[PDB]
Design a protein around this ligand. Structure first.
Ligand SMILES: Cc1c2[nH]c(c1CCC(=O)O)Cc1[nH]c(c(CCC(=O)O)c1C)Cc1[nH]c(c(CCC(=O)O)c1C)Cc1[nH]c(c(C)c1CCC(=O)O)C2
Ligand SMILES: Cc1c2[nH]c(c1CCC(=O)O)Cc1[nH]c(c(CCC(=O)O)c1C)Cc1[nH]c(c(CCC(=O)O)c1C)Cc1[nH]c(c(C)c1CCC(=O)O)C2
Lengths: 356, 356
């Protein structure tokens, strides 16, 4: 692959000092860009995900507008449940759905052997290799997947939920079947994530988007072991294949209660939502791991000047070391691309001022 | 499409006698027009190129001022490298750039299959069809592209260069990879150029703008074969599609040394820069092909009276037959529209005096 030119994001992820603070935005390829809407209008979402050229194009679009310090491959988190044998539908103005969710233990019988899932996800690897080539070393390419618990929630609930009452009812009433499903997902995620790196991914982020519905006790029992296993096994397989392990990011949204554990879970970077004050986060995680985040995405509705001030304050709190700037969640569809650019520029400007 | 009303330019291109000498100007749609600046201020350059209505408007603007005998579609030469998978940026007051140029053989792997490029350039075809309809037969519409070597230079150098030292270093040190890249470009250019004619282009000009950096030996080895192949294949495909081939113009700027070869390269018209005396050019190319050119663009800084005299002398040198008037390169941004009109009127006036 082409040699990396701007590696600031990788150096930061590993905890090295850098000349400025690298920045990227979750959902940087998203509907807030008119050009994203134009490209997506041709196919449906899961069909777009299966076109390497379409994925590459959507990945590159934000970088043409903004000097972001990383690209993230365009794909879905639900590709993994899909590859395990569940049928997803994408609903107009309402979202993804599994019309036949898992609701009893016997339903696990209809899933694929997790060892074959990577083969079913060849299209993601194709998208990654293409994008890595087309980026031509400008910035690093991040691969991603959903964490085991979060994927379990979509598979059991059949979509999003305000309570995760059905998936939590599995944890309490069906602990064994829950651990079985969580192990299947882990065993599918490991080869998938390793394949992303084989294909050219230079960093990996695991999205535990539904962490917050668990308290500490359930998170430690049912989410954390599998978070840990994913990191440990992905690094093991990469080293055994003669490849370099990549920095791994764990993002547990609404996971304030788990930060101290997450810092010891074998991820280089711990991503933060906007509800955790940066200084408190730093106390929780300690002085090795890198923090990523965490501006309220809604702060981008403020004026460009206001965004600059909020960014300044955020960077003062995090300090210069062991930090990668981002939002505390993904960009929303009604956001102004010029305010995303304001965000990116302010991180670069103030992080330099903070050093010299 | 609407029937052509004024076909003087086409008759001249094919070497027929005409009542007067047709004229057009390279960059006639350009920044020297205040109205061009006004229209371009809304989008960036490559974005303007992707709007058929914007391209049509910019194409028509010069014809509203001057009775030019041809229109040339508003587009870029770098659209082809872009469609092959390279990222271009357009720099304020400095120009186009590929921040990730091709520098080793392995970099060729990140290009598209040349057979898919025409599909990526549908927006140019849309612009051409719209403009052809809107022109309503007033004058012929010229399509264009960059020649293989010239496109290679931008892809390897990453922009303009005073020496082409990097691209020439490919020719000398990487002849095979050079021929590979030049073949990719040829194979992309052929379907693109044919698509321009399908879309309504009535003539085609290939710009070998960087010919002069090569001597005769390298030009014959690396530029000429692909110039020749483009003409031969474009004409073949058009005839096989049941369409009429169009006159093709080869313009090798600073290509004095190659004129005799260019006259046998399968182009109806050989464009000339202002450094070649018209009578010497005619000796080089012989008596079949039509010559196009060649007034020093800077001559338009002279008074309207002086421009008339320089035009008279130029037309005396070329003689009435097998000639299309133009500048020896494109109009510069600080030029006076009234002096472009003086140029056009003087060609029409003196060419008529030269016949009767
Ligand atoms: C509608 C929807 C999709 N996918 C999803 C939804 C529902 C989200 C919700 O709860 O509101 C589910 C999803 N998508 C993503 C996540 C993880 C993020 C998180 O929740 O922490 C989850 C759980 C990130 C993503 N989503 C996407 C990526 C790929 C990277 C990128 O696009 O930048 C990631 C990591 C791409 C995607 N995927 C989808 C869209 C519309 C997009 C474009 C971005 C946007 O406008 O939202 C379909
Ligand atoms: C700045 C720039 C552009 N494009 C380019 C540059 C750098 C040129 C340089 O070396 O100084 C590159 C370019 N543009 C064109 C050529 C081929 C001409 C040649 O060099 O022989 C090349 C190599 C012709 C053209 N350039 C354009 C066309 C379309 C036809 C037309 O505009 O009349 C052609 C054939 C349009 C164009 N394209 C661009 C502008 C500003 C314009 C308007 C014309 C102007 O004021 O220069 C962007």
């Amino acid at each position: 692959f082409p040699e990396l030119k701007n590696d600031t994001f990788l150096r930061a992820a590993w905890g090295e000092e850098t000349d400025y603070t690298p920045v990227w935005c979750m959902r940087q390829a998203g509907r807030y860009l008119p050009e994203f809407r134009e490209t997506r209008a041709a196919q449906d979402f899961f069909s777009t995900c299966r076109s390497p050229e379409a994925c590459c194009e959507l990945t590159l679009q934000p970088l043409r507008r903004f000097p972001l310090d990383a690209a993230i491959i365009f794909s879905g988190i639900l590709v993994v449940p899909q590859a395990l044998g569940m049928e997803v539908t994408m609903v107009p103005g309402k979202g993804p759905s599994f019309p036949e969710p898992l609701r009893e233990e016997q339903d696990l019988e209809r899933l694929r052997d997790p060892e074959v899932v990577a083969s079913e996800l060849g299209y993601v690897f194709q998208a990654i290799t293409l994008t890595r080539q087309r980026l031509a070393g400008r910035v690093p390419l991040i691969g991603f997947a959903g964490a085991p618990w979060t994927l379990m929630t979509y598979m059991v609930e059949g979509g999003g939920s305000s309570t995760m009452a059905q998936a939590k009812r599995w944890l309490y009433q069906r602990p064994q079947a829950s651990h079985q499903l969580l192990r299947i997902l882990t065993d599918a995620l490991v080869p998938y994530l390793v394949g992303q790196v084989v294909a050219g991914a230079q960093a990996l982020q695991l999205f535990e988007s539904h962490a917050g519905h668990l308290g500490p006790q359930l998170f430690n029992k049912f989410a954390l072991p599998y978070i840990r296993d994913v990191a440990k096994q992905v690094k093991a397989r990469l080293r055994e294949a003669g490849l370099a392990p990549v920095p791994m990011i764990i993002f547990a949204k609404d996971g304030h209660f788990a930060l101290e554990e997450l810092a010891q879970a074998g991820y280089e970077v711990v991503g933060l939502d906007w509800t955790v004050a940066p200084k408190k986060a730093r106390e929780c995680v300690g002085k090795t791991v890198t923090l990523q985040g965490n501006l309220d995405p809604c702060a981008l509705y403020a004026s460009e000047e206001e965004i600059g001030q909020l960014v300044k304050q955020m960077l003062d709190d995090f300090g210069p070391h062991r930090y990668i700037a981002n939002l505390g969640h993904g960009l929303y569809p009604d956001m102004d691309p010029e305010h995303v650019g304001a965000f990116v520029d302010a991180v670069h400007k103030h992080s330099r001022l903070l050093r010299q």
